[PDB]
Amino acid sequence: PLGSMPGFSQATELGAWKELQEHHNSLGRNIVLKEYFEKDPQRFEKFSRTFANPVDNTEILFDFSKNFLTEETLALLVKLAREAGVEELRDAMFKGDPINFTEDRAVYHVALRNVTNEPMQVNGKSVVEDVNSVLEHMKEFTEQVRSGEWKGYTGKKITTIINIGIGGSDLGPVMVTEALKPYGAEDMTLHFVSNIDGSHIAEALKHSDPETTLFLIASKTFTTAETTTNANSAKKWFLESAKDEAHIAKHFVALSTNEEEVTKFGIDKKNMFGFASWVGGRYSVWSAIGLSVALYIGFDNFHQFLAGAHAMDKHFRETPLEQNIPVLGGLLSVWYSDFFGAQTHLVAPFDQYLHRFPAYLQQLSMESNGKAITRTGEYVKYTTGPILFGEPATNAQHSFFQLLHQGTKLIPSDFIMAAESHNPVEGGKHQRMLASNFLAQSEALMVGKTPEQVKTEGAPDNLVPHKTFLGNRPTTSILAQKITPSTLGALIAYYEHLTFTEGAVWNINSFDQWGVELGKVLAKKIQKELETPGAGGDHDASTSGLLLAFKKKANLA
Amino acid sequence: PLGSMPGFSQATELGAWKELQEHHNSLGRNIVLKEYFEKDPQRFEKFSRTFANPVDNTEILFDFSKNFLTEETLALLVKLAREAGVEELRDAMFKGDPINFTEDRAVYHVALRNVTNEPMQVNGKSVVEDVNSVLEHMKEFTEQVRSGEWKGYTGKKITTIINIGIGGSDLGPVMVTEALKPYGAEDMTLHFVSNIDGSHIAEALKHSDPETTLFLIASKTFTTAETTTNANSAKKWFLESAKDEAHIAKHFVALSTNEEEVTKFGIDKKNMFGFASWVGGRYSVWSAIGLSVALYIGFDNFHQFLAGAHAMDKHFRETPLEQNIPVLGGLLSVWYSDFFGAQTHLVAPFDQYLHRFPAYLQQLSMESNGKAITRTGEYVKYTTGPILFGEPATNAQHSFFQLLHQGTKLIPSDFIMAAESHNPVEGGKHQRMLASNFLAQSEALMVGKTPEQVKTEGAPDNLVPHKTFLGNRPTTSILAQKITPSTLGALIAYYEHLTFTEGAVWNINSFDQWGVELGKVLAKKIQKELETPGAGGDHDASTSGLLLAFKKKANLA
Numbered sequence A, B: 001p002l003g004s005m006p007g008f009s010q011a012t013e014l015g016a017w018k019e020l021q022e023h024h025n026s027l028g029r030n031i032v033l034k035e036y037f038e039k040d041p042q043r044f045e046k047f048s049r050t051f052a053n054p055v056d057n058t059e060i061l062f063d064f065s066k067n068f069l070t071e072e073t074l075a076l077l078v079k080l081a082r083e084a085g086v087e088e089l090r091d092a093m094f095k096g097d098p099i100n101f102t103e104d105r106a107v108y109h110v111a112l113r114n115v116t117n118e119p120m121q122v123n124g125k126s127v128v129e130d131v132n133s134v135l136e137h138m139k140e141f142t143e144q145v146r147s148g149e150w151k152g153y154t155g156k157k158i159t160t161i162i163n164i165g166i167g168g169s170d171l172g173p174v175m176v177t178e179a180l181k182p183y184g185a186e187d188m189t190l191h192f193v194s195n196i197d198g199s200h201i202a203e204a205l206k207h208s209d210p211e212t213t214l215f216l217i218a219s220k221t222f223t224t225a226e227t228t229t230n231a232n233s234a235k236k237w238f239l240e241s242a243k244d245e246a247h248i249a250k251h252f253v254a255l256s257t258n259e260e261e262v263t264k265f266g267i268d269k270k271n272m273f274g275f276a277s278w279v280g281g282r283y284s285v286w287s288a289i290g291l292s293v294a295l296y297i298g299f300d301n302f303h304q305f306l307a308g309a310h311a312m313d314k315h316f317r318e319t320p321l322e323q324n325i326p327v328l329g330g331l332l333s334v335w336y337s338d339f340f341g342a343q344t345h346l347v348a349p350f351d352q353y354l355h356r357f358p359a360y361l362q363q364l365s366m367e368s369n370g371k372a373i374t375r376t377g378e379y380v381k382y383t384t385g386p387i388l389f390g391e392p393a394t395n396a397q398h399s400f401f402q403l404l405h406q407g408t409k410l411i412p413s414d415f416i417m418a419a420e421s422h423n424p425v426e427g428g429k430h431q432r433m434l435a436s437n438f439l440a441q442s443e444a445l446m447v448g449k450t451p452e453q454v455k456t457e458g459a460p461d462n463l464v465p466h467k468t469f470l471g472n473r474p475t476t477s478i479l480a481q482k483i484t485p486s487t488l489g490a491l492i493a494y495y496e497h498l499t500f501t502e503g504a505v506w507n508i509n510s511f512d513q514w515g516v517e518l519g520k521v522l523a524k525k526i527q528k529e530l531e532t533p534g535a536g537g538d539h540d541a542s543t544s545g546l547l548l549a550f551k552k553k554a555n556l557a
């Protein structure tokens, strides 16, 4: 049924927002971090938080103390969270209420990792047994493929997995298999095919054998333009060798919401791994979409990944806002975005395996919060989601940290590192050097280097400005024990709940994506024009000019 | 010797800047692209440019017409370029004058690709014969490795190349070998090791054989912390198998400015591929640093890559500002950054092989122009380089194009595509679909979709705002024939000269990087503290708190 009117319309109408604007005008805008640290030796104790991971029995330290925060600032941000009903929206999410108000849908990625089987329901029906049934199917199938009990059409062990999917059906599987590579099967090659660009499927198939390749067709809808075309091209390549369509049942499985479209494709109903409409693509790695992860690292490691997210769900659900870790991360994002004018958010993992973690967060953050319409249907009077970007450190330091230290933008930055490496090369020397950069970069961004310090080191007087570091550049530092499956699960859930918190304060829908439809509709029209002699003139002069140049260069009538 | 005072101090003091501010206030801020296209059927003719690539005999179309430009706007931006002496600084660069004013150095990447051997000189001495000598050495060495004439210590053909380097010694080689993969040797595996994180070298060595692995130690300085440690770990792994140090001469070569440090490392002087101090790292792929590219795709393809850059150098050098392609790209960046408040710049190649092209441009752009000090030593009164980011399309469309279409930021965007694929799978269907997305995304961002259009399609009245597209989101579209070596060379040179143009207008040094030194110095101090029992307390409370947590989690006294 229908529910209540929203608690508020515009974030800018909330009393706490107006107090934050007054706080910014008189105090927040004059925060100099190095002065706050000089005057407060308990600053780190005040603004750090420790999360217990009970799956691997470790702790993750979240240090927020190098942010533009005072006790007064934190009090006002938590007050804004209470006035915006962050806890109410959170509790509605966990109850399975349809908080996705533009699609009338629950938002229930939290049910996918409900490893304690707490009661969970959508539309008065429990979802727990169905979540568990798909997981038991994923368990059985992954054991058979990894053991070699599941065989190819000529009776060989599967050694190549090709995931075919785009956006939420690709970025999670890529990022998590890259991140957890140390746990991966030694004899298994993974390919992630996503782009419609034929270079992607071509390179994957070029070095694969139909006899030893299993395909995962990953599509919530099973009607995505890119994925259906890639799947079709994969099926033609397979049949070129296997000849017999009956063989498809040993080489193709489907990860989808849409049984009818899967069966249409020629996938055996028994080889379908389902997920519900209340699983958003950018929140889907926890579902059947994680099958490539469970194949690579095994079902038990996949389940520990779910369990680490579950521990962060419990922290988010039960912790008072003053100590709540994702909530503070989300309020800091609002503080920087809407009061300091920051258009970006850097995430730099000090970890090469996490090299696809920023790209994953870019979809989670930007597709969720790149929105301008409130629950009340008004255009926001304030900026919403930032441009999220990053690369792993120390690579990032040698690419664009120049601009972070000496450029003209405020760039709120999250640095993430594990204390222990899976590859402790040369007696730990590589890892102590990585750690020294993790510690030093946040230090350097906070303290800078004064003209007086530069002159003391012997710089030419007229080069002092060039070598000065203003400092006062904020950072959040996250120190884990080791990137295990459960630790990675908890880190993603942190960013999911930070993203939730931002959207709740902004009063937008974190869970829809209406903004992708126009490009899809216009691309289909243009594709028909490219296939049609003499067509393509019904556009603006630029689109028409580009379409004509493309037809001339590609030899199309 | 010493030269002249700078032509100006602050960009904001130039008459043309003040005319642009008045132009923005009265007209530029009210530009609605769809209205300008409705009223001007020759808009595309006015603001598109064609670059002839004489190496592959193709054309690259640069369409700027979906930007916030009128004839009056372009006239004022070109006027700002003349008042800022863009052509004077350009001509000084090509003459080998020391325009890198903070390091007293020439800026002579343009000499590296001087394929017509035009006279070129630094400090009254020709550089041409020395550039050509290194190239002839790169030619001879790459022929021997690729032919199998160069053999390993047990007489086998080299099949694995491991490049070890960071920033400008890594991102170019990675991006260019990924981009030009169709031209790459079928039997060759490349690894690019860059991160100090031991996971990077470990994964590369895990599946390599010392007998068939050649290492390229890529370092301008040959004293980078990460690269010396990685090189050292590579040498220990090699010697664990080869035992005899004499064998190093068949498995390790150096790409450096610093002969003394290379010989120190134990590399035979004959296996050193030199480049000059006037080659910046982020401008170095054209030099000896491109050796991994010439090994992979052959010397002739490498030389065509140089020649395509040379054709774009000639365009930049000889074209009047009204028609000059990189100049217009750089002025648009100033226009958006300093008059519309855009903090970001999206680059989305509609090309999976170009998947590392945005990361390459991120270093070029942000390390060059992430600067705040003028030639006159003042702090800029205006923002400088943007945050540059991106991912290949169509992947990008399914990740963050939601925010580009419906979010609250202005994001100047460059879309790049080739008309022809190297992998024309399924009779060109993948490529026509990719092209349809390239054309449609810029169309969609410009025209949007009105509330009236949304209601016509049958949307619930109270969902109309959620499904509305405001449009008026600018783009630059770049359509090449095919990503050949020379076409890629010309595209990079475009971005190098766009970057030059931005820095010339802003009156900053595009060519120094003082902003990386503080982090390096502070990391070395912390590394010594990590190695020293009881040390690490002499920091701010956050750095001290993180360092202590790291020592507890990593078991360090």
Ligand SMILES: O=P(O)(O)OC[C@H]1O[C@@H](O)[C@H](O)[C@@H](O)[C@@H]1O
Residues within 6 Å of the ligand: A165, A166, A167, A168, A169, A218, A219, A220, A221, A222, A223, A224, A227, A281, A282, A367, A513, A516, B397, B398, B399
């Ligand atoms: O998994 P599907 O139904 O093929 O959709 C994949 C992606 O498609 C895109 O249009 C959306 O931006 C994403 O939310 C989604 O993840």
Ligand SMILES: O=P(O)(O)OC[C@H]1O[C@@H](O)[C@H](O)[C@@H](O)[C@@H]1O
Residues within 6 Å of the ligand: A397, A398, A399, B165, B166, B167, B168, B169, B218, B219, B220, B221, B222, B223, B224, B227, B281, B282, B367, B513, B516
């Ligand atoms: O090639 P080298 O001397 O090892 O330096 C590599 C990188 O080092 C970094 O400090 C700089 O940010 C880059 O400009 C440079 O490319």
Ligand SMILES: [Cl-]
Residues within 6 Å of the ligand: A040, A069, A070, A071, A072
């Ligand atoms: Cl305080």
Ligand SMILES: [Cl-]
Residues within 6 Å of the ligand: A391, A392, A395, A396, B359
């Ligand atoms: Cl990188």
Ligand SMILES: [Cl-]
Residues within 6 Å of the ligand: B040, B069, B070, B071, B072
């Ligand atoms: Cl005009």
Ligand SMILES: [Cl-]
Residues within 6 Å of the ligand: A359, B391, B392, B395, B396
């Ligand atoms: Cl991607």
Ligand code: NA
Residues within 6 Å of the ligand: A055, A056, A304, A305, A484, A485, A486, A487
């Ligand atoms: Na675990």
Ligand code: NA
Residues within 6 Å of the ligand: B055, B056, B304, B305, B484, B485, B486, B487
């Ligand atoms: Na060429």
